[PDB]
Write a protein that holds these residues in place. Structure first.
Motif, PDB file in Angstrom:
ATOM      1  N   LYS A 283       1.532   3.738   8.886  1.00 36.56           N
ATOM      2  CA  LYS A 283       1.974   3.122   7.642  1.00 36.56           C
ATOM      3  C   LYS A 283       2.123   1.623   7.853  1.00 36.56           C
TER       4      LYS A 283
ATOM      5  N   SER B 266      -2.845  16.845   0.303  1.00 40.72           N
ATOM      6  CA  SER B 266      -2.883  15.385   0.309  1.00 40.72           C
ATOM      7  C   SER B 266      -2.617  14.824   1.700  1.00 40.72           C
TER       8      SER B 266
ATOM      9  N   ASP C 238       0.843  -1.188   0.000  1.00 38.94           N
ATOM     10  CA  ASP C 238       0.000   0.000   0.000  1.00 38.94           C
ATOM     11  C   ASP C 238       0.881   1.241   0.000  1.00 38.94           C
ATOM     12  N   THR C 239       0.676   2.109  -0.993  1.00 42.82           N
ATOM     13  CA  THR C 239       1.470   3.318  -1.158  1.00 42.82           C
ATOM     14  C   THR C 239       0.654   4.559  -0.782  1.00 42.82           C
ATOM     15  N   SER C 240      -0.450   4.361  -0.056  1.00 40.70           N
ATOM     16  CA  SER C 240      -1.299   5.486   0.325  1.00 40.70           C
ATOM     17  C   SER C 240      -0.565   6.451   1.247  1.00 40.70           C
ATOM     18  N   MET C 241       0.214   5.920   2.184  1.00 39.09           N
ATOM     19  CA  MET C 241       0.900   6.705   3.202  1.00 39.09           C
ATOM     20  C   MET C 241       2.372   6.925   2.885  1.00 39.09           C
TER      21      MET C 241
END
Ligand SMILES: CCCCCCCCCCCCCCCCCC(=O)OC[C@H](COP(=O)([O-])OCC(O)COP(=O)([O-])OC[C@@H](COC(=O)CCCCCCCCCCCCCCCCC)OC(=O)CCCCCCCCCCCCCCCCC)OC(=O)CCCCCCCCCCCCCCCCC
Ligand SMILES: CCCCCCCCCCCCCCCCCC(=O)OC[C@H](COP(=O)([O-])OCC(O)COP(=O)([O-])OC[C@@H](COC(=O)CCCCCCCCCCCCCCCCC)OC(=O)CCCCCCCCCCCCCCCCC)OC(=O)CCCCCCCCCCCCCCCCC
Ligand SMILES: CCCCCCCCCCCCCCCCCC(=O)O[C@@H](COC(=O)CCCCCCCCCCCCCCC)COP(=O)(O)OCC[N+](C)(C)C
Ligand SMILES: CCCCCCCCCCCCCCCCCC(=O)O[C@@H](COC(=O)CCCCCCCCCCCCCCC)COP(=O)(O)OCC[N+](C)(C)C
Ligand SMILES: CCCCCCCCCCCCCCCCCC(=O)O[C@@H](COC(=O)CCCCCCCCCCCCCCC)COP(=O)(O)OCC[N+](C)(C)C
Ligand SMILES: CCCCCCCCCCCCCCCCCCCC(=O)O[C@H](COC(=O)CCCCCCCCCCCCCC)COP(=O)(O)OCCN
Ligand SMILES: CCCCCCCCCCCCCCCCCCCC(=O)O[C@H](COC(=O)CCCCCCCCCCCCCC)COP(=O)(O)OCCN
Ligand SMILES: CCCCCCCCCCCCCCCCCCCC(=O)O[C@H](COC(=O)CCCCCCCCCCCCCC)COP(=O)(O)OCCN
Ligand SMILES: CCCCCCCCCCCCCCCCCCCC(=O)O[C@H](COC(=O)CCCCCCCCCCCCCC)COP(=O)(O)OCCN
Ligand SMILES: CCCCCCCCCCCC(=O)SCCNC(=O)CCNC(=O)[C@H](O)C(C)(C)COP(=O)(O)O
Lengths: 438, 58, 77, 120, 83, 15, 536, 127
Positions: free
Chosen positions: H8, E78, C8-11
């Motif tokens: 994360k 963002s 996951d590259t959202s954060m």
């Protein structure tokens, strides 16, 4: 005594006549009846009879059965823990195998004849080969390991029993005999060396436990390991005390080495069942050494610690089985967030792990104190060695708990009503023994 | 002379060879990571450090 | 079936990339170093053993010297 | 200097050196009041050599500044609490949805729950 | 909290005004730093000032990619932790 | 697919 | 009446942690403080009856807790003057911490479980203090150890907190193992576990070393102090309880209850721990870390004083009781500052409008730590420093530790209040309820009462010292405080770095001890059971 | 906000794992850590074990200097300008029994030698 033995013989008998659909209900009722008969045996055991509380013979030396302090505790433990195994197992084949194993083990504990002891304990040899080597969830390697180790040790014990029967003319415990022979002592000792896992003969146990069903693992750790202490107290120390005193430096070396190497090996384990198995191997060393000191403090301490282990290890194996049913994994790395996801499973797991670490409100504390006192009675260094290395158990247990306690998890994996019902007796028994009703 | 020793499967070579490519876990990046092995160094009393830290009036 | 191997590259913007990896080779201490540290730490752990050995040796040596002197005094006299 | 820093181009390397030096100024300071003179001193230090064109001298300056920034790394970096390396990072992480809950677990085939021994 | 573009823009503009060289009228919501007159060292200081303004920590790789007024505002918008 | 033991040697050489 | 306090704490633990679904968050905010108030009333009665009026009482709950052959121990409670004093201090601090947790832990999901752990923690501390035999003390020692493991690691999704809890557990296991060995030595050669019969005029050195090694664990002394600094991962109420009373004090209590210590060792170990802790606290930049290093330094002073004179045990306990109040106040105030500012770093604190009560309580606790004259901390610290003059080595180190203590304490006070604002321009706020004000009122009341009532009987007894030698602690403290306000540099960057790394004890353990441990495990398993002895 | 803060997630393993991967602790959040901090990877403050040892080598002599003088160089007669506290004979005899007592260093007493030998007692129990 007669009631207990009769109920023991009735439990395998009942299965032959059941409807094949009522098998589980009948087996549970029979297990509870056997527990109640064991309570009756305890009631009919007067402390006034200091040597043997009760002895019964049914026409021969082989059929001589009797209960002593060690025998009484182990028999009560087996009867207490069997209902849990019964409910955890499904299928007529599995029930038949388990009930036959239990009958053989429970008859072995009360036997007072070495040859009869051998006949009853080793009858459950193929049944364990078949159980550990079951079609889908079993391993043939583990079955071969346990079977070969048992056969070789029991054959050595049998040879020693044959010599004692030839030389003295009887092999019954009730007849006072003493032997100074070292070959015969070694023959009797090798069985104890293998059955109670002691380095380097402990390899069979972890394989068997990992690939055994939860009922099998619970029975194995709970009582099968204890059968060594009955053989020591009843069939080794009375006759071969001289050889235990002659070899005490070697016995101590092997027991301490087992405790250390097993503790270090537990550190490299990634499977919950293997962790519990290696913890048992480490715990067996103190019991073996304490009994070998041949002192009042040691024999009582060893039996007490055995009961504490027979109450704490089945609990951990039961919780591990419940978790595996919920998740189909035993790898600590895959299991995370169990604190948040299973607050009820986690509470019991933490409680049992605290018990395994010999904390004060647990039976393990009292038992350890007594065993350490017996070692200190022998030598101060003996006690110190065992006390110091106990930290290794803490390191592995802490690491496991920490890995399981936190993280990110997307699966709610908590115990059902059936799972809580299965551990409640074990929890209550642990608490009661912890408060001093040992 | 032929002997058991010739036909025994001695453990002299690994049966299984681990895969060469191995996983390195992701870690937060430290820009400058050279270890300081010298307790007493000229760097501590460097002219740059004196101008940047020691000298400015506070 | 198996879990996805896609991260996951959202954060990634907020907390940094995962490009940087560990430099450890995942291998343990050398055998030579281990021998020294085992044979150094274990004696430290067994401090009571050495105290008992020391005292016992001193006691036995004193007792033997006492016996020797006793013999000497009991010979002439 | 780490490998990631070394791969960077000259311009990005000097920007990184300035950034890291400013952060280390913050870490070693006792208050915001100290930061301003020290930050102006660091700015002047970089400005002084900015017009150098000799590649060899520039390399020497960069290497020395990197060794200084490596030695003067703080034991305790001043990091915001909510970010990685912070006290409140992960304290109560937000739960993601799509959690797999099995309702009425003990009532699914209640009588036949248990382990079976299959044979040939 | 997802901070709106208008607030982020006004505060980034407020921060950019502080450089002495920059003319108070050149800074627009979509302007490159080069046109504003900022050097490389100045860009680092501006990114750090943005770090003080919104109370966030910018990873160095992203901070390198910030070189125009537009991308900075986008990045802050963002970010969910920007205050 | 499951993890399996590595077999030393080439298939045709072993055969 | 004496049993009631332990009953109230264990009840509050069982209620909050087993019946919290019914009680609710508000129910724990009631039952906790109510039970602790009742326990305070009982502890006050116990203190008056035993300490002031010299009436020790023994309550035997049941006999034959362990009955194997000759070995026999019973669950019995003897309230002696040491027990009464510690019971009172522990319950007062716990009642304050319970009042504090009502507002601090509102933002935490398990407030019921937290309150349950705090009450069980207090109960096990009272069991340890009041035990009449060594087994009861061990029961308390392990119970506080387990409660600390469950409280430091409260945040499970943080790898640091779980590692900090594992660290605490392992260190405490090594210490309680040495204690078990010493208890076995004492039982074997004296015949009993009761402290009355435990008395031995001459004890072999081995027992003394084992006792000291056992004590240095809980009372984090040198080589065993690694866990205290790490224990900062836990919530602030935990840190206040462990550092001020429950954990650090147990080691001193054990040493004072059974005087088997050796003068040569305790003095050197204590003075070393005092100096090292002060130096470590100088480098520290986290507010909660500095107060932990201060705790280490003070523990060093208490351990060191036992060597100086016969009254050292009384002086140590007096310092222990004086220290628990101010240190608890320092931790609770630090927690409130962190909560109000959302920051843990001293650099970003500054002058800002706040509550008068919190700022005063912080100032007075810092002054007590510093040694300001005519304060409870001053009398308890001067009693130690003045009586340590005879031991030239201990005295010099302890004076240097006094200087370093003053320097960091003054620097922290300047940074938190006098310094200009250092945090960002963002909306942050923590409103304090009347419960927090009651908590600070209780702490201030303890601090005031300590001045009037004193800490030891021999506190004001004359030490026959020249005036210049008697008043030197004050000059050293003032000099350190003045140097700390000026925020001057004392050491080179090499030493500041060394002190920031805490002496590199943990780097040594990781590079050498942990590697050796896992190499022994590799040889034991991979090479042997699953290598040489495993079939193809 | 203490609760509900963003985190994360650690990327899923995508390469063959090293044999000793159990040395890494990963709960699923991005910053995983070694089992013991400082065992491998980045070291806090960029300080190696050699640096710490050199520091301790510089520090140890200065710290040990006060203790070595009194304990070794000094003697009972010269350590302090006074004798230990004087007690009545009944009190003194009982107090002298304690090995960890303070009355054993009274040189003035005619029982000094015996008291000194009592203080330097047995290392371990003889029986
Ligand atoms: C008077 C009034 C009336 C009141 C009643 C009183 C009467 C008293 C006794 C009467 C009771 C009837 C006796 C039962 C006879 C048949 C039993 C049987 O076939 O077992 C399986 C059978 C289950 O049948 P099934 O499920 O329908 O399928 C079987 C198919 O035929 C084939 O299925 P498969 O091909 O899939 O095989 C799979 C196999 C997996 O494969 C294996 O594991 C093979 C292993 C080899 C044997 C196991 C070795 C270890 C056995 C230890 C003995 C168990 C007791 C332990 C106590 C220690 C004793 C020293 O698993 C099993 O079969 C079951 C596993 C465990 C059972 C093993 C125990 C049986 C031992 C010998 C049976 C007797 C046969 C005699 C034949 C007579 C004429 C032909 O019966 C059971 O319910 C369980 C066994 C009950 C054991 C009691 C029998 C006594 C044996 C103990 C020896 C003591 C000496 C004898 C004295 C007894 C009292 C005087
Ligand atoms: C302690 C010091 C450090 C310990 C070891 C350090 C160096 C060891 C040096 C020895 C060595 O290298 O052994 C490797 C060697 C195996 O060769 P390999 O390179 O591993 O691979 C060959 C296989 O194909 C391998 O293929 P595989 O993987 O399929 O087979 C693996 C197999 C291979 O394993 C074996 O074949 C032998 C396993 C036990 C060896 C017994 C003692 C060996 C070392 C003890 C003293 C070493 C001091 C030097 O392992 C097993 O599964 C069997 C073990 C299960 C039973 C566990 C019983 C343990 C008993 C003693 C444990 C060893 C002590 C360490 C723990 C200490 C606890 C007290 O083992 C031996 O040859 C045994 C050496 C001595 C045997 C005892 C004397 C035999 C008596 C024969 C008398 C002749 C009678 C004449 C009449 C004949 C007509 C019938
Ligand atoms: C899912 C769980 C939810 C429900 C939670 C249940 C809550 C349980 C409550 C905890 C119980 C605490 C009580 C501890 C004492 C144990 C009670 C007991 O054992 O009864 C004693 C009687 O003694 C008592 O009643 C003790 C008084 C209990 C309450 C007094 C104060 C309460 C404060 C708790 C502190 C207890 C410290 C003891 C540490 C060992 C039996 O008397 P005897 O005839 O002498 O028995 C022989 C002794 N032996 C057991 C060793 C064989
Ligand atoms: C001695 C006389 C009286 C004895 C009373 C003792 C005090 C109460 C004892 C209650 C039962 C003892 C052990 C309870 C089960 C052990 C599990 C446990 O304590 O906590 C569980 C869960 O707790 C429970 O549900 C039951 C606790 C109720 C009361 C516990 C009080 C503290 C335990 C006392 C320690 C036992 C002493 C054993 C050694 C002396 C797990 O908690 P965490 O791992 O921290 O995760 C929780 C989630 N979170 C991350 C958010 C923190
Ligand atoms: C010389 C010894 C003198 C005294 C010995 C007492 C302690 C010795 C070593 C202490 C190890 C205990 C620390 C620990 O358990 O914590 C580790 C857990 O580490 C482990 O579990 C690894 C196993 C280490 C335990 C034993 C290794 C040392 C054994 C000593 C000698 C080895 C063999 C000798 C005889 C067997 C967590 O690491 P941290 O990152 O520092 O956690 C702190 C939190 N924070 C993230 C904020 C920094
Ligand atoms: C109201 C209902 C209460 C609900 C829950 C309470 C449950 C029971 C509470 C009190 C009852 C205690 C009995 C448990 C075991 C005590 C056994 C015991 O100590 O007596 C021994 C009898 O010998 C023997 O051989 C006894 C053997 C049988 C004991 C149980 C063996 C383990 C079975 C499974 C564990 C569960 C235990 C519960 C001899 O004692 P002594 O000679 O050593 O001297 C005593 C000093 N130590
Ligand atoms: C005067 C005489 C002089 C001395 C002469 C000695 C000569 C040989 C003596 C050896 C006797 C020991 C008998 C055990 C042999 C080892 C086991 C066989 C190895 C093996 O491959 O078994 C496989 C599984 O076994 C297993 O998984 C078992 C693992 C190893 C068992 C460990 C042995 C028990 C403990 C050993 C000693 C303990 C105490 C000694 C007193 C099954 O193979 P397969 O069914 O696939 O067949 C296919 C054909 N390859
Ligand atoms: C190397 C370390 C030893 C490993 C064992 C460690 C701990 C085991 C202790 C078990 C406790 C009771 C067993 C009694 C003796 C067994 C081993 C004792 C040590 C030993 O080997 O002594 C030998 C005598 O024992 C003997 O003569 C008999 C030795 C055992 C025979 C081996 C297999 C026998 C199996 C027989 C099956 C049943 C037969 C029944 C008829 C020679 O010592 P020494 O006195 O000659 O001193 C001359 C040296 N200078
Ligand atoms: C006030 C009371 C005293 C409190 C603490 C005092 C500690 C004093 C001991 C340190 C002073 C003497 C150090 C030995 C001389 C070494 C001089 C240089 C060291 C060196 O070159 O190698 C180092 C060896 O580690 C070492 O030097 C480890 C040796 C330490 C001996 C064990 C003593 C316990 C130390 C606990 C705290 C000390 C922290 C720092 C040592 C680093 O080795 P490397 O990892 O770079 O090798 C590469 C891996 N292949
Ligand atoms: C806590 C202690 C603080 C640590 C202080 C350590 C810091 C060391 C300070 C010394 C480091 C230097 O001088 S490193 C300076 C090295 N000198 C050069 O690179 C000359 C060439 N200049 C250019 O390429 C550009 O001008 C460029 C500069 C990239 C800007 O680009 P812009 O034209 O677009 O602004």
């Amino acid at each position: 005594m007669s009631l207990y033995l009769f109920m023991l013989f009735l439990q395998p008998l009942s299965l032959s006549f059941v409807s094949r659909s009522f098998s589980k209900i009948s087996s549970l009722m029979m297990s509870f009846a056997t527990l109640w008969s064991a309570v009756y045996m305890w009631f009919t055991s007067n402390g006034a009879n200091q040597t043997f509380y009760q002895v019964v013979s049914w026409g021969s030396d082989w059929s001589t059965f009797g209960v002593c302090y060690t025998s009484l505790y182990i028999s009560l433990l087996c009867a207490f823990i069997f209902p849990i195994c019964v409910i955890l197992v499904q299928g007529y084949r599995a029930l038949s195998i388990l009930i036959c194993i239990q009958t053989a083990v429970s008859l072995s504990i009360v036997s007072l004849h070495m040859l009869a002891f051998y006949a009853l304990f080793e009858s459950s040899l193929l049944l364990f080969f078949i159980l550990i080597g079951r079609r889908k969830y079993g391993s043939l390697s583990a079955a071969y390991n346990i079977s070969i180790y048992t056969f070789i040790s029991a054959l050595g014990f049998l040879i020693s029993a044959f010599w004692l029967n030839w030389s003295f003319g009887s092999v019954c415990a009730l007849l006072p005999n003493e032997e100074a022979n070292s070959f015969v002592a070694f023959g009797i000792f090798i069985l104890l060396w293998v059955k109670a896992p002691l380095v380097p003969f402990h390899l069979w146990l972890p394989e068997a436990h990992v690939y055994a069903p939860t009922a099998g693992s619970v029975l194995l750790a709970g009582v099968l390991l204890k059968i060594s202490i009955v053989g020591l107290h009843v069939f080794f120390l009375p006759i071969c005390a001289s050889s235990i005193v002659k070899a005490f430096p070697l016995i101590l070396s092997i027991c301490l080495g087992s405790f250390i190497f097993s503790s270090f090996s537990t550190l490299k384990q990634i499977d919950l069942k293997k962790i519990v198995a290696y913890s048992s191997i480490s715990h067996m060393a103190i019991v073996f050494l304490s009994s070998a000191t041949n002192s009042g403090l040691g024999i009582q301490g060893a039996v007490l610690y055995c009961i504490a282990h027979g109450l704490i290890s089945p609990g951990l194996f039961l919780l591990v089985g419940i978790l595996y049913k919920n998740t189909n994994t035993k790898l600590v790395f895959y299991l995370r967030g169990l604190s948040q996801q299973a607050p009820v499973w986690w509470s019991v797991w933490v409680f049992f792990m605290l018990g395994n670490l010999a904390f004060p409100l647990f039976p393990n504390f009292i038992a350890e104190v007594v065993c350490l006192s017996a070692l200190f009675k022998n030598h101060e260094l003996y006690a110190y060695a065992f006390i110091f290395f106990s930290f290794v158990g803490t390191v592995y247990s802490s690491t496991v708990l920490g890995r399981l306690k936190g993280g990110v998890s997307s699966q709610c994996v908590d115990a059902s009503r059936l799972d809580v019902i299965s551990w409640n007796p074990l929890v209550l028994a642990t608490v009661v023994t912890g408060i001093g009703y040992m | 002379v032929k002997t058991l020793a010739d036909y025994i499967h001695w453990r002299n070579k690994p049966s299984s060879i681990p895969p060469v490519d191995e996983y390195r876990p992701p870690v937060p990046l430290v820009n400058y990571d050279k270890l300081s092995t010298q307790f007493f160094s000229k760097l501590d009393n460097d002219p740059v450090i004196n101008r940047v830290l020691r000298a400015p009036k506070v | 079936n198996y879990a996805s191997l896609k991260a996951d590259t959202s954060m990634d913007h907020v907390f940094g990339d995962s490009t940087n990896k560990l430099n450890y080779d995942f291998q343990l201490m050398s055998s030579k170093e281990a021998f020294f540290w085992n044979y150094t730490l274990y004696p430290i752990v067994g401090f009571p053993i050495f105290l008992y050995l020391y005292q016992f040796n001193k006691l036995e040596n004193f007792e033997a010297e006492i016996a020797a002197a006793k013999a000497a005094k009991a010979a002439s006299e | 200097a780490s490998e990631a820093v070394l791969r960077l181009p000259h311009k990005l390397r000097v920007m990184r050196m300035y950034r890291t030096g400013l952060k280390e100024i913050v870490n070693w300071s006792y208050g915001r009041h100290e930061f301003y003179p020290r930050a102006n001193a660091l700015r002047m230090e970089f400005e002084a050599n900015k017009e150098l064109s000799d590649r060899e001298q520039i390399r020497k300056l960069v290497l020395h500044g990197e060794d200084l920034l490596a030695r003067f790394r703080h034991w305790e970096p001043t990091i915001r609490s909510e970010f990685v390396g912070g006290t409140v990072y992960g304290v109560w992480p937000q739960h993601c949805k799509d959690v797999k809950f099995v309702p009425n677990p003990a009532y699914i085939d209640e009588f036949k729950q248990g382990d079976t021994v299959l044979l040939y | 909290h997802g901070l709106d573009r208008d607030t982020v823009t006004e505060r980034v503009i407020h921060v950019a005004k502080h450089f002495e060289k920059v003319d108070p009228n050149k800074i627009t919501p979509t302007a490159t730093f080069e046109e504003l007159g900022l050097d490389s060292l100045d860009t680092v200081e501006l990114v750090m000032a943005l770090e003080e303004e919104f109370g966030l920590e910018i990873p160095d790789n992203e901070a390198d990619k910030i070189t125009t007024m537009a991308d900075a505002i986008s990045y802050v918008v963002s970010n969910p932790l920007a205050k | 697919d499951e993890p399996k033991h590595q077999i030393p040697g080439n298939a045709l050489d072993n055969w | 009446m004496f049993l009631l306090a332990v009953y109230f704490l264990f009840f509050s633990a069982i209620a909050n942690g087993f019946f919290g679904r019914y009680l609710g968050v508000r129910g724990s905010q009631l039952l906790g403080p109510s039970a602790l108030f009742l326990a305070l009333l009982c502890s006050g009665t116990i203190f008056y009856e035993v300490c002031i009026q010299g009436c020790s009482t023994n309550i035997k709950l049941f006999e034959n807790f362990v009955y194997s052959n000759e070995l026999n121990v019973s669950a019995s409670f003897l309230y002696d003057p040491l027990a009464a004093t510690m019971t009172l201090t522990v319950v007062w601090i716990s009642c304050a911490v319970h009042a504090y947790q009502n507002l601090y832990m509102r933002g935490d999901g398990s407030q019921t479980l937290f309150t349950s752990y705090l009450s069980a923690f207090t109960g096990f501390m009272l069991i340890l203090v009041a035990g009449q035999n060594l087994v009861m003390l061990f029961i308390g020692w392990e119970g506080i150890g387990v409660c600390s493991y469950l409280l430091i690691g409260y945040y499970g999704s943080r790898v640091s907190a779980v590692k900090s809890a594992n660290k605490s557990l392992i260190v405490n296991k090594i210490s309680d193992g040495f204690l078990l060995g010493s208890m076995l030595y004492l039982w074997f050669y004296t015949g009993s576990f009761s402290y009355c019969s435990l008395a031995t005029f001459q004890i072999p050195d081995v027992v003394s070393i084992l006792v000291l090694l056992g004590a240095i664990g809980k009372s984090s002394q040198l080589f065993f102090h690694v866990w205290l600094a790490d224990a900062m991962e836990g919530p602030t109420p935990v840190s206040a309880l462990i550092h001020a009373a429950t954990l650090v004090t147990a080691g001193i209590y054990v040493l004072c209850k059974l005087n088997l210590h050796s003068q040569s060792a305790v003095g050197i170990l204590g003075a070393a721990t005092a100096l090292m802790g002060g130096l470590f606290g100088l480098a520290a930049n986290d507010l909660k870390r500095v107060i932990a290093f201060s705790t280490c330094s003070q523990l060093g002073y208490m351990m060191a004083v036992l060597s100086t004179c016969d009254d050292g045990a009384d002086f140590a306990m007096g310092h222990l009781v004086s220290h628990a109040g101010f240190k608890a106040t320092l931790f609770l105030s630090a927690g409130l500052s962190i909560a109000k500012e959302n920051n843990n770093f001293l650099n970003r604190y500054g002058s800002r409008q706040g509550s008068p009560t919190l700022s005063f309580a912080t100032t007075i606790a810092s002054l007590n730590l510093l040694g300001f004259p005519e304060l409870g901390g001053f009398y308890s610290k001067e009693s130690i420093l003045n009586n340590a003059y005879i031991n030239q080595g201990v005295s010099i180190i302890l004076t240097l530790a006094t200087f370093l203590t003053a320097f960091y304490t003054s620097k922290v006070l300047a940074q938190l209040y006098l310094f200009p604002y250092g945090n960002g321009r963002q909306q942050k706020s923590f409103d304090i309820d009347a419960t927090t004000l009651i908590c600070f009122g209780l702490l201030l009341s303890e601090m005031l009462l300590r001045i009037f009532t004193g800490s030891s009987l021999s506190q004001n007894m004359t030490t026959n010292l020249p005036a210049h030698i008697k008043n030197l602690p004050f000059w050293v403290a003032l000099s350190g405080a003045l140097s700390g306000l000026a925020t001057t540099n004392l050491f080179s960057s090499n030493f500041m770095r060394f002190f920031g790394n805490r002496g590199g004890f943990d780097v040594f353990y990781a590079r050498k001890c942990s590697n050796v441990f896992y190499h022994n495990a590799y040889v034991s398993y991979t090479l042997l059971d699953r290598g040489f002895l495993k079939l193809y | 906000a203490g609760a509900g803060g963003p985190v994360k997630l650690s990327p899923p393993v995508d390469k063959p794992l090293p044999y000793n991967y159990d040395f890494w602790m990963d709960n699923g959040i991005y910053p995983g850590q070694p089992i013991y901090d400082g065992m491998f990877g980045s070291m806090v403050g960029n300080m190696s074990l050699e640096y710490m040892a050199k520091g301790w080598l510089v520090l140890l002599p200065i710290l040990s200097a006060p203790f070595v003088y009194e304990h070794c160089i000094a003697d009972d007669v010269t350590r302090n300008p006074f004798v230990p506290r004087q007690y009545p004979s009944e009190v003194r005899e009982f107090l002298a029994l304690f090995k960890n007592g303070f009355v054993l260093n009274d040189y003035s007493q005619p029982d000094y030698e015996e008291m000194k030998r009592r203080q330097s007692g047995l290392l371990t129990p003889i029986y």
